Design an enzyme around this catalytic site. Sequence first.
Site, PDB file in Angstrom:
ATOM      1  N   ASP A 111      -5.987   8.589  -0.252  1.00 15.88           N
ATOM      2  CA  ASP A 111      -5.541   7.563   0.691  1.00 15.88           C
ATOM      3  C   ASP A 111      -4.356   8.098   1.470  1.00 15.88           C
ATOM      4  OD1 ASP A 111      -7.346   5.919  -0.586  1.00 15.88           O
ATOM      5  OD2 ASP A 111      -5.825   5.072  -1.934  1.00 15.88           O
ATOM      6  N   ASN A 120      -8.535   5.593   3.354  1.00 16.89           N
ATOM      7  CA  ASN A 120      -9.259   6.490   2.450  1.00 16.89           C
ATOM      8  C   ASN A 120     -10.135   7.575   3.111  1.00 16.89           C
ATOM      9  OD1 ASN A 120     -12.001   6.795   0.694  1.00 16.89           O
ATOM     10  ND2 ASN A 120     -10.176   6.812  -0.616  1.00 16.89           N
ATOM     11  N   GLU A 138       0.832  -1.198   0.000  1.00 16.67           N
ATOM     12  CA  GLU A 138       0.000   0.000   0.000  1.00 16.67           C
ATOM     13  C   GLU A 138       0.867   1.249   0.000  1.00 16.67           C
ATOM     14  OE1 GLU A 138      -3.093   0.770  -0.431  1.00 16.67           O
ATOM     15  OE2 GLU A 138      -4.142  -1.130  -0.260  1.00 16.67           O
ATOM     16  N   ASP A 144     -13.630   9.799  -7.103  1.00 12.07           N
ATOM     17  CA  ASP A 144     -14.559  10.312  -6.102  1.00 12.07           C
ATOM     18  C   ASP A 144     -13.923  11.450  -5.307  1.00 12.07           C
ATOM     19  OD1 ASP A 144     -12.746   8.844  -4.611  1.00 12.07           O
ATOM     20  OD2 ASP A 144     -14.259   7.928  -3.319  1.00 12.07           O
ATOM     21  N   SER A 186     -11.324  11.448  -3.472  1.00 13.07           N
ATOM     22  CA  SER A 186     -10.797  11.082  -2.165  1.00 13.07           C
ATOM     23  C   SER A 186      -9.287  10.872  -2.237  1.00 13.07           C
ATOM     24  CB  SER A 186     -11.448   9.802  -1.662  1.00 13.07           C
ATOM     25  OG  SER A 186     -10.997   8.691  -2.405  1.00 13.07           O
ATOM     26  N   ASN A 225      -7.430   9.826  -5.589  1.00 13.75           N
ATOM     27  CA  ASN A 225      -8.359   9.077  -6.435  1.00 13.75           C
ATOM     28  C   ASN A 225      -9.305  10.030  -7.149  1.00 13.75           C
ATOM     29  OD1 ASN A 225      -7.551   6.429  -5.291  1.00 13.75           O
ATOM     30  ND2 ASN A 225      -8.408   7.338  -3.437  1.00 13.75           N
TER      31      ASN A 225
END
Lengths: 98, 129
Positions: free
Chosen positions: B53, B60, B35, B49, B51, B46
């Site tokens: 991380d 998120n 990750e 949407d 958002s 991202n």
Amino acid sequence: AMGEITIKLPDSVKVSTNSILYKCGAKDLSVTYYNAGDISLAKLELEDETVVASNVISGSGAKYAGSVYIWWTKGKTASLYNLIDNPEEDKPISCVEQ
Amino acid sequence: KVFERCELARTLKRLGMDGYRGISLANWMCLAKWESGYNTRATNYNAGDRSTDYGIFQINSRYWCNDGKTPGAVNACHLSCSALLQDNIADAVACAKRVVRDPQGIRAWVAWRNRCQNRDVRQYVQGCG
């Protein structure tokens, strides 16, 4: 007939629409994202189907579920899972933003 | 902060992560590796949407923390996302423990699905000891 889904929201929230192009191997994939506050939807124009998926809870990335598919983005990459052809979910199609 | 592998493993073990909701320390380590590369400062946007991380577990901003710029945010961990970018990973671990209550469990992380699921991950806790 109509050629449009119109979802009437109950408040004056801002609605944004954004088309993003992906390459999935040798193939092109157009995804349109619809964002209205809490709501996030993705229309995927796949070769075999036009799907509308909804953003669902995930730990990382932006994960969308609809029909037999999961579309899960992380940064510039994405995985398309087909839960009918690949219920074990270990062979998604890999995509990248163009 | 970028953790050294065994340093991270010892830290997570002290914070009760081994066996937490049935998840092995080795799987948590493999999750962290793929990750974020064990990097508490990692972020990833991202565009879908809007958002982001955050941190070592790439948690998120639509569901778990408040970043002030993600529409539809719920903040289920009750943390600012900046708390997830700190060298001390106590808050990140607390939030990750909340995330794994999900029906998915550790399947809630896409990098774990892509890189650790269906593989032997015992090597991540070996040679430390």
